[PDB]
């Protein structure tokens, strides 16, 4: 269940990165040494995702069925496979961070891997 | 008799060296074969010989005996355990050589009265009429447990340099860290008893009087071995030992416990103790167990906490 | 003719040096096996009227075999087989079943002091004599013929009981061992022979 | 005897070095076997050799002896502890080599009346008549505590550059941080006492006269080791050290305190000391404890505050 | 009990956000550096909820039974699962804020998670 | 599958080394004694690869067909044969490192072998 | 193919020894009792060879044609005849070491023989 939470946090970070086209929040998350830095990124990335939801540029979908998130940014279309974190996942993840900030680095490494694979595939098709 | 199986944990250790090559001091290793799904693998694993343990035990026995006033030989007072082997050794102590076979027992008794170490440790005299005495303490090689599919032992080389103001200074030492196990046997019943047939020779009454003190000293000498006062290179490479598991059996008949190479070796030895007492018509059978790694023990065993209590109970 | 089987668990191995550089043997000689049995009755005495307290059990037949893997190393030859299993078969008629069974549980070492060996189980029974073609794992004498392929046979030299006395060398007798040199193991060999005792399917060959 | 166990906390540390690869200076590392709830594992952890501690102790002893008027060898006056191993050292100091075995004692005395370092730390001479003297102070490797399932140690590399106005200057340094533990043992009952067996030789009266001063200096020399004055690269990588726990035992019989690996190693060693005094027929057993982390200690134990008080109490 | 208080404050913030369609109060709460900013948001969000109660657009309910709050806004229907804070929860939360303003960030992060999940589900059904 | 994961991690390290012209990350990876050091290198090398992807100096291709990665650095062209690791490969590799840091040394040795062979071939052709 | 792999590893060790003028890595390789010691030497020798490649002091060539490696340790020019190991040779050699560390001793003995013959000729 800890790995599932970390994977859902990594999906949130990857969606926020692909939508904003900025690595800055993922960099801050993977370099965090305190719960303050982690929590600030968790808010700021969800605030970016909230704008994408309100603009209908971020939407949940199913793809062949697996749960996925469609992201439209600057005329590029991306699809992240998996769920976004629940409020309980954020709370349980913050408790994991209060024990060991290592889990922020693990989620950041996964998020960057998701984003890199999607960006590589999108450039190849173009 | 007394039998024991003990498990040890040692880190950053170099106690038993071997022949030096170039400017390198090497550790003592032995080959083992490990079974894998693919096949078999031959691995070299560090070991400690059974002679250093005997030397440490004899030195501790000498130190304990000289405090209680028991007789000690001249060459054995110095830590040189040549014992009464050749004529030159006998010349210093002042013992006449045996005359013939029929007198052999007498000679033994004389030796047995002039040196306690020659009694418990045992001695051999080469010559026209040889005399023998088997050791009362039996020790085995210290080899780490071959448990599971992994050997918990390593061996690395360390580089050391001496500083000088006029260079014209380099050596290497092998260090290891393993999980050792070793077993031992002792027969306190045969202490102060001659080991040659014949007729009784004058002087056995002194041995009968000294039997109790010699037995007590021999039992006491096990504390040094069970505490970790063996080996060499302790001035700069002092190791860090620790006790994990210990089983000691006291009986009135021959018996030994299982080797400590498996994770469950106390239940087996308890069951075998019961079975052997059933067949050999024994009367006394007691087992003392010290457990620190949390392995299964069984039922019908007194549980101790330290090694001193074990020695006290053995002496009682 | 009564027979007994014993299963021994070795601690680190056995070491017997060849008579007359100190190379060692691969498997223990029958003299050591007989001495280990005699230890159960003659404990505490080292000289009987003077060659050995073992010149009385000289007519007890004994064989032994391995059940695990080991390595022979000279560093004084030694045979490292830690935590291994040894199977020893005693065939005789001098004493009844009770005495042989009692002495079988009283084995403490094979060879020198360091070669301790615990006892796990024993079996006692009556053996039968046959002469037909059999398959065996225990080592036998040189004069015994062989029908199979000569691929896992080695030659060693042992001594009779005459060597039990000090200051005297025993007679030389050749022996054939069905052993692989490296790694150490045991293999089956088919022999015809003249005398073979069935001690539970694993026929023991003596001549 | 005086036996001690000490725990230290060190951060941003590099006092011991090994062979370098490229532009990287490496820190000494050793394998350790550690027990976890899943079994036993092997890890690689930075360590510090005991030879540096011995060198620091000997240098402090040299300084104290020179200040107090005790004799110091010519080569040992400079911080180069070659002692009397080679013939060049003997020629420089001016001591004739031993002729036969019977003269060896004399040679030892001649070495022992000139340098306190040879007396305390032992020495070796190799030749026709070799002479040996074991060190009276015993140390070991400095290993972090193997407590729990996670080792409280870390190692990393750091980047450094050298400035220059005409580029044509880059290196890396290894830095570690850990909670170290180590134990020591020195026998003050054998200081200023010859070890080679033989007859009386003129000059032992001076040794008997100076025995008290030599023992006092040897006890005083432990302050440097207990304070933290050891290791190299102190010019630019001065470490931050802080004492956490210390146990010191003074006995008339051999004894070894428990290693500082478990959180409860003071109560255990005090109980073991009491039982060992009971069983070994001793006549003196005292314990001193310095605690700054609020762990369990026990009852009826003297509690100190600093290390200087401990040194004064040991001297008195 | 501290987590239950924070969760009830997060439910209040999420109800106020969904009813007002404005993130401004949640943004102010999650960025608060003083007890003044936190207390001002706690009043303003409850004042918005009070208007929704008076209009019968905010009501307590049970849903399969779990306690919930129904919110009607701009013809959208939302359901927040959980209780609203008591006066004692507000007072105990203000005492937690007087010790550490971190708890306002924790409540804000939870509130935004609740609101985002509900908005995503409502857009998918449409 | 463990060897395939190690080989894909070695390809990532080799691509990062050839693009950055710096062995420092491979040195850190092969000398790692903790999961912290390994995870830090896995982030930093992927961050270097991400910059090369954004600049179109790192691209996936096929070569005669085998999967490959083209790397352009300082006017030199390199081609690494094989796949880059997935997010699942990074996660499974980190689990292998949590059991035994030996796998970081194995991946580092393979990465340096790939880079050395490519650098030797490129110098010979020049 | 096992002997070809061992020969290519021996060539790598000999090139590293001739370039560094140090036997220490070959000594460590020939005395290895674990996969750790062997793997550490395989990295360190390749790291030395990498520096020689970057400095253009180590280069592949052909000599009469046999594949060879030229090594300049300054004016001291050496030529080792044969190929350097591939990544697959290192991986297959490490698998051989995981079965039997003897192969490290065999490669070390060959490497020292190559280096000695070249130093004698020079």
Contact E11, E71 (CB under 8 A): no
Using CA of residue D194, residue D199, residue D203, residue D205, what is the dihedral sign? positive
- Cα gap B6→B14, rounded to integer Å: 20
Interface contact flag, B44 G100, Cβ < 8 Å: no
Q: Are B157 and B138 in contact (CB under 8 A)?
A: no
Of A3, A116, A123, the CB nearest to F49: A116
Place of tokens 């490969």: F89
Q: Does F56 touch chain A (CB under 8 A)?
A: yes
CB A32 within 8 A of CB A101: yes
F33 and D29 in contact by Cβ < 8 A? yes
Q: Which residue in this structure is represented by tokens 């550059």?
A: D161
Q: Is the dihedral of CA D69, D72, D74, D77 positive or negative?
A: negative
Mutate to test the interface with F, among D25, D36, D157 (most CBs of F within 10 A): D157
Residues paired with E29 in a beta bridge: none
d(CA F113, CA F93): 20
Using the Cβ of F22 and the Cβ atoms of chain D, whether some distance falls under 8 Å is answered with: no
Token representation of residue B236: 């700069």
Q: Is B156 on the interface with G (CB under 8 A)?
A: yes
Query: Cα F72 to chain center, whole Å?
Result: 15
Physical contact, A and C (3 or more Cβ pairs within 8 A): no
Q: For residue C162, what are the contacts with CB-CB under 8 A and spacing of at least 6?
A: C168, C170, C171
Cβ(F48)–Cβ(F22) below 8 Å:
no
Strand order in the sheet with C117-126: C61-66, C85-92, C2-10, C117-126
What resolution (Å)? 3.5
H or E element that contains B118: helix B116-120
* Whether G38 contacts G29, CB under 8 Å: yes
E81 near A CB under 8 A = no
Angle between helices D50-68 and D204-220 (to 10 degrees): 120
Strands C204-205 and C196-198: antiparallel
Q: Taking the CB of residue E125, how many other CB atoms lie within 10 A of it?
A: 6
Q: How far apart are CA C88 and CA E22, in angstroms?
A: 90
CB contacts of A50 in chain E (<8 Å) are 23, 112, 115-116, 119
Q: Do B44 and G33 touch (CB under 8 A)?
A: yes
G40: tokens are 């550490």
In angstroms, rounded to a whole number, what is the distance separating the alpha carbons of residues C174 and C204?
A: 18
List, in sequence order, every residue forming a beta bridge with B154; answer none if it has no partner: B177
- Cis peptide preceding D291, ω within 30 of 0: no
Which among D64, D71, D114 has a CA at the least distance from the CA of D220? Answer: D64
- Establish if B29 touches chain G: CB-CB under 8 angstroms: yes
Helix (H/G/I), strand (E/B), else coil: E58: strand
Distances in Å between the Cα of G81 and the Cα atoms of B157, F125, G10, G73, G108 are 32, 21, 11, 17, 16
Angle among Cα B136, B142, B148 to the nearest 5 degrees reads: 135
Longest CA–CA separation in chain E, Å = 44
Distance CA(F8)–CA(F5), nearest Å, equals 5
Angle (CA) G12-G18-G19 rounded to 5° is: 90
Biggest alpha carbon distance in chain F?
44
| Interchain CB contact of F27 with D (< 8 Å) | yes
- Give start and end residues of each alpha helix (H) in D1-103: 50-68, 74-77, 87-93
Q: Provide CB contacts within 8 A for B208, sequence distance 6+.
A: B192
> Cβ distance B218 to B242 under 8 Å?
no
Q: Which residues of G touch D19 (CB under 8 A)?
A: 24
Q: How many CB pairs under 8 A join F and G?
A: 50
Burial E12-48 (b: 16+ CB within 10 A, else e): bbbbbbbbbeebebbbbbbebeeeebbeebbebbbeb
B neighbour chains, 3+ CB pairs within 8 Å: C, D, G
Instruction: Please enumerate, as own/partner, the contacts of B120-126 that have beta carbons within 8 Å and a separation of 24 or more.
Output: B120/B61, B120/B191, B120/B214, B120/B218, B121/B54, B121/B58, B121/B61, B121/B81, B121/B83, B123/B83, B123/B84, B123/B85, B124/B83, B124/B85, B125/B84, B125/B85, B125/B86, B125/B98, B126/B85, B126/B86
Q: Return phi, psi of residue B175, to 5°.
A: -125, 150
Angle at G61 between CA G56 and CA G64, to 5 degrees: 145
| A126 contact F CB<8A | no
Q: Which residues of D touch B234 (CB under 8 A)?
A: 138
Instruction: Kindly provide the residue ranges of all beta strands, DSSP E only, lying in chain F, ordered along the sequence.
Output: 58-63, 66-73, 76-81
Q: Please give, rounded to a whole number of angstroms, the shortest distance from the CA of D30 to a CA of chain G.
A: 12
Identify which of G43, G60, G86 has the shortest CB distance to residue F112. Answer: G43
Place of tokens 């694979």: A117
- Burial of residue B167 (number of CB atoms within 10 Å: 0-12, 13-18, 19+): exposed
Work out the angle at residue B248's Cα, subtended by the Cα atoms of residues B243 and B250, and round it to the nearest 5 degrees.
160
List Cα–Cα distances, D296 to D149, D243, D281, F18, in angstroms: 21, 17, 28, 56
In eight-state DSSP terms, residue D30 is E
Are G105 and B44 within 8 A, CB to CB? Answer: no
DSSP B183-236: EEEE-TTSTT---S-S---TTHHHHHHHHHHHHHHHHHTHHHHHHT--SS-TTT
Backbone angles phi, psi at C28, to 5 degrees: -65, 145
Which residue is closest to F14 within chain G, CA to CA?
G87
Alpha-carbon gap: C48 to the closest alpha carbon of chain B (Å): 7
D170 touches chain G (CB under 8 A): no
Q: Is the CB of residue G42 less than 8 Å from the CB of residue G33?
A: no
* Neighbors of chain E with 3 or more C-beta pairs under 8 Å: A
CB of F36 less than 8 A from some CB of A: yes
Contact criterion met (CB below 8 Å) for D313 and D249 = no
Among residues E33, E122, E38, E120, which one has the least CA distance to residue E76? E122
Q: How many CB atoms lie within 10 A of CB E82?
A: 17
Residues D302, D289 contacting (CB under 8 angstroms): yes
Chain D residues at the B interface, defined by Cβ less than 8 Å, are 18-19, 28, 30-33, 35, 39-40, 42, 47, 49-51, 54, 78, 80, 82, 122, 134-135, 137-141, 143, 146, 183, 185, 197, 254, 256, 259, 261, 271-272, 275-276, 278-281
Q: Which of A87, A91, A92 to mutate to test the interface with E (most CBs of E within 10 A)?
A: A87
Q: How many CA atoms within 13 Å lie on the side-chain side of D258?
A: 18
Mapping DSSP to helix (H, G, I), strand (E, B) and coil, where does residue D186 land? strand
Q: For residue B75, give the chain D residue with the closest CA.
A: D197
Closest residue of chain F to D24, computed from CA coordinates: F27
Q: How far apart are CA D51 and CA D55, in angstroms?
A: 6
Q: Please, what is the end-to-end C-alpha distance for chain F in angstroms? A: 38
Contact yes or no for B258/C112 (Cβ under 8 A): no
User: What count of residues does chain G have?
Assistant: 122
| Cα dihedral D82, D87, D90, D96 sign | positive
Torsion of CA B276, B278, B279, B280, to 10 degrees: 70
Strand locations in G66-111 (E): 66-73, 76-81
Chain G, 55 to 94: residues with Cβ < 8 Å from chain B are none
Please, which residues bridge with residue B250 across strands? B2, B286
> DSSP string of chain C?
-EEEEEEEEESSEE--BPP----B-SS--HHHHHHHHHTTTSTT--------TTTTSTT-EEEEEE-S-BEEEE--EEEE-TT-EEEEEEEESSS-HHHHHHHHTT--BSSSTT-BEEEEEEEEEE-EEE-S-EEE-S-EESSS---S--SS-EEEEEE-GGGGSTT-PPPEEEEEE-EETTTBEE--EEE--S-EEESSSS-EE--
Asked if the C-beta of G86 comes within 8 angstroms of chain F's C-beta atoms, the answer is yes
Closest CA to C14 of C87, C111, C100, C107: C111
């Amino acid at each position: 269940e800890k790995e599932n939470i970390i994977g859902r946090i990594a999906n949130l970070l990857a969606v926020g990165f692909l939508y904003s086209e900025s690595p800055t929040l993922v960099d801050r998350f993977a370099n965090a040494l305190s719960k303050e830095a982690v929590t600030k990124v968790l808010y700021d990335v969800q605030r970016i995702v909230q704008m994408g939801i309100d603009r209908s540029e971020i939407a949940t979908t199913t793809i062949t069925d697996y749960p996925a998130v469609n992201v439209n940014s600057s005329g590029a279309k991306y699809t992240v496979v998996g769920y976004l974190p629940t409020s309980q996942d954020i709370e349980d993840f913050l408790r994991m961070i209060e024990e060991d900030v290592y889990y922020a680095r693990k989620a950041g490494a996964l998020a960057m891997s998701i984003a890199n694979r999607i960006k590589l595939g999108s450039k190849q098709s173009k | 008799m007394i039998s024991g199986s003990v498990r040890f944990l040692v880190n950053l250790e170099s106690l038993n060296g071997v022949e030096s090559i170039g400017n390198l001091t090497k550790h003592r290793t032995a080959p083992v074969v490990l079974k894998t799904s693919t096949g078999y693998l031959v691995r070299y694993v560090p070991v400690i010989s059974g002679e250093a343990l005997a030397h440490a035990y004899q030195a501790s026995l000498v130190d304990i005996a000289k405090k209680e006033g028991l007789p000690v030989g001249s060459l054995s007072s110095q830590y040189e355990f040549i014992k009464f082997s050749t004529d030159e050794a006998l010349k210093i102590e002042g013992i006449k050589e045996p005359k013939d076979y029929n007198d052999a027992r007498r000679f033994e008794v004389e030796v047995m009265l002039k040196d306690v170490i020659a009694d418990v440790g045992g001695f051999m005299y080469a010559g026209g009429a040889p005399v023998r005495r088997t050791s009362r303490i039996k020790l085995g090689y210290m080899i780490p447990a071959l448990r599971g599919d992994e050997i918990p032992a390593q061996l690395e080389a360390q580089f050391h340099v001496r500083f000088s103001n006029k260079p014209v200074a380099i050596f290497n030492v092998e260090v290891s860290s393993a999980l050792y196990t070793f077993s031992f046997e002792l027969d306190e019943d045969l202490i102060a008893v001659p080991s040659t047939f014949g007729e009784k020779v004058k002087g056995e009454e002194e041995l009968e009087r000294q039997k109790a003190k010699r037995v007590k000293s021999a039992i006491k000498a096990l504390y040094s071995l069970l505490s970790g006062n063996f080996g060499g290179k302790r001035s700069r490479f002092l190791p860090s030992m620790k006790l994990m598991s210990l089983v000691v059996t006291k009986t009135d008949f021959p018996f030994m416990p299982e080797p400590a190479h498996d994770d469950d070796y106390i239940k087996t030895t308890i069951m075998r103790l019961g079975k052997a007492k059933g067949v050999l018509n024994g009367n006394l059978a007691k087992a003392y167990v010290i457990n620190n790694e949390g392995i299964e023990v069984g039922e019908g065993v007194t549980v101790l906490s330290t090694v001193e209590d074990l020695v006290v109970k053995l002496e009682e | 003719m009564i027979y007994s089987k014993v299963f021994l668990k070795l601690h680190w191995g056995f070491s017997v040096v060849k008579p007359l550089a100190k190379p060692g043997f691969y498997l223990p000689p029958p003299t050591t096996l007989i001495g280990a049995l005699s230890y159960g009755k003659f404990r505490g005495v080292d000289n009987i009227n003077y060659g050995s307290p073992a010149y009385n059990f000289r007519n007890i037949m004994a064989t032994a075999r391995l059940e695990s893997e080991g390595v022979y190393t000279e560093d004084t030859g030694k045979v490292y087989i830690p935590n291994g299993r040894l199977v020893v078969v005693y065939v005789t008629d001098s004493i009844s079943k009770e005495e042989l069974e009692k002495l079988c549980w009283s084995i403490t070492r094979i060879g020198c002091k360091e070669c301790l060996a615990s006892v796990e189980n024993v079996e006692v029974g009556e053996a039968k004599k046959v002469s037909g073609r059999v398959k065996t794992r225990y080592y036998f004498r040189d004069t015994v013929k062989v029908v199979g392929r000569k691929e896992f046979l080695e030659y060693v030299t042992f001594w009779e009981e005459n060597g039990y006395i000090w200051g005297k060398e025993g007679s030389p007798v050749r022996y054939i061992l069905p052993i692989t040199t490296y790694p150490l193991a045991s293999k089956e060999v088919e022999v015809e022979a003249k005398e073979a005792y069935e001690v539970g399917g694993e026929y023991v060959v003596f001549s």
